[PDB]
């Protein structure tokens with residue numbers, strides 16, 4: 001039902017919980033890096049420009 | 052299972068011989084219905100909406 | 102210590118275009134208020150456009166109506182550009198009836214007392230057949246910003262009426278704003294600034310009340326900074 | 330058609346002169362509409378008092394040398410702009426700096442006037458070399474509405490009247506239940522000590538409302 | 547890229563620009579000179595820095 | 597023939613104009629290019645790829 | 647429609663059937679959002695049967711997943727058309743030009 005309160009709960013599980021990001025040809029170990037997740041609207045993944 | 056049958060006797064629901072297999076709208080996509088077609092195998096009686 | 106401005110000449114060209122002067126401004130306040138007003142004007146100004154339209158025969162925006170050369174969502178797109186200003190009503194429903202080989206303009210809508218049509222020449226749809234009948238309910242309401250039709254079917258709670266064509270609503274009466282800050286001379290006062298805001302409307306809202314409500318909003322937001 | 334007003338104005342402050350005030354939620358566009366128009370008032374058009382003009386005892390020119398001081402005359406002027414003066418009921422005051430000896434001359438070494446308050450008595454004005462070496466001058470502070478350079482003076486030191494030393498505003502996203510995107514405004518500000526940051530913001534936006542007084546419905 | 551253009555544009559200098567030759571107490575008053583339209587981003591300028 | 601079409605329309609030959617940041621209201625140093633570029637939407641729509 | 651074009655916009659739009667091109671020249675008798683009737687000129691008209699060239703337009707129908715293909719009439723009622731004119735644009739065509 002996507003009740004409004006599950007969103008506020010999702011922030012709780014998300015906080016100190018890193019996720020892994022991987023881009024297509026994984027050449028060196030940097031092709032998988034762990035980031036802390038930021039809840040964003042829309043269907044796109046937001047990537048830090050320096051990484 | 053035992054426990055599920057105990058659940059059947061408490062709230063008294065006639066356990067179905069049938070399983071839900073309806074065509075449902077894929078999650079995330081949304082729009083308007085603009086056509087329905089029904090092709091019925093020859094010999095089956097064409098249903099109401101058909 | 103600080104000189105405060107007022108609105109002087111408000112020169113109006115077309116019903117859609119206007120040029121508003123703000124005359125007793127200090128150095129730096131021409132641009133400080135000019136942008137922060139352009140920012141308010143374009144984004145958060147009350148106005149009204151059409152929210153929902155019921156068409157007689159049509160079941161949905163992807164149909165055809167015998168006797169009309171416009172597709173239904175082309176007719177819905179014509180209504181999105183219907184410029185109505187309504188008086189003491191928050192939502193009003195209009196009724197459009199016209200038949201014959203004539204283009205159906207916005208003057209062909211039944212006129213309510215509280216309702217004013219800005220563009221009577223505005224084209225809603227054309228009629229090709231002789232006796233080609235069309236009749237519709239168009240539901241206008243006042244609103245702010247840009248409300249899509251997608252976000253309207255969350256509350257819903259039985260909007261089942263299968264023939265109620267929901268349309269996107271772009272309620273801002275502001276189309277375009279530019280502000281040019283030139284020096285102002287008011288007898289003695291070495292250097293002051295004359296702020297000219299130039300703005301285009303859809304005709305529904307008049308320029309003076311727009312600026313008044315623009316700066317009214319601005320004073321209210323600073324209320325959370327007058328204290329903490 | 331009533332508007333959104335913010336809540337929880339949490340005020341995380343580093344020292345009395347520095348502060349960072351976060352205030353959410355704003356309607357969309359209001360981060361920059363309020364953030365910018367407030368930085369513009371703070372930086373450019375803010376009442377204050379700093380050092381405007383100084384007459385020097387030993388020399389009449391800014392491009393000379395003073396016997397007994399290791400700072401160039403125009404290096405002492407940078408110290409004077411950074412003298413944080415708050416004056417009470419006086420519109421023009423003139424101070425006296427009487428001091429000699431093998432000591433650095435601080436702002437506590439200025440005569441303490443009734444209407445004059447020095448924010449940094451520890452503040453360093455200039456240094457004194459060996460022997461006694463005599464130095465004493467009268468320094469005149471002036472009121473202003475912003476920052477007036479000496480270049481714009483036609484009838485000299487730069488005058489930083491605005492108590493802001495630096496202002497920046499950062500706009501980040503805010504979430505309010507079922508309200509996808511709003512604006513959370515982060516204001517960070519440095520003062521010269523005369524006015525503290527919290528009251529500076531209050532007086533900053535009051536000025537803005539006054540300009541709008543001829544428009545509020 | 548986008549960023550190194552920015553810093554290269556900052557840490558640049560042109561021959562005769564708004565602010566050419568003034569002396570500023572610290573980096574803070576140097577940002578104040580730029581955001582107020584008084585000093586140009588690239589003008590040779592002595593500033594007291596620590 | 598391109599610069600000459602711009603003249604006929606009362607537009608600058610450089611095809612660049614002075615632009616203003618709608619956020620702070622302040623002008624942009626240097627003239628940026630503005631003009632009309634035909635742009636497509638390719639069917640890699642994100643709500644398919646996600 | 648591309649303001650910046652190259653000229654081939656017509657040749658690509660016309661030759662793929664996504665549009666609706668005039669069989670024979672004449673005048674429009676009736677223009678619906680559905681169909682279009684062209685009263686044929688005598689010189690282009692065949693002796694028996696007489697007749698009028700009638701083009702039924704494609705309306706909102708599914709493509710090879712998942713996109714749509716829908717045609718729109720681009721002539722107004724009682725307008726002269728000649729052989730090879732565009733009676734109805736299709737998807738990504740405006741007035742007979744490739745508008746992708």
Ligand SMILES: Nc1ncnc2c1ncn2[C@@H]1OC(COP(=O)(O)OP(=O)(O)O)=C(OP(=O)(O)OP(=O)(O)O)C1=O
Pocket residue numbers: 022023024025640
């Ligand atoms: N680890 C990855 N990192 C970045 N991109 C990836 C990764 N894996 C798949 N893609 C993209 O996903 C499809 C292919 O997926 P798969 O190979 O068929 O496998 P599975 O069916 O199980 O998803 C392509 O993208 P596209 O179809 O848009 O076309 P493209 O290759 O030119 O980018 C791939 O780039």
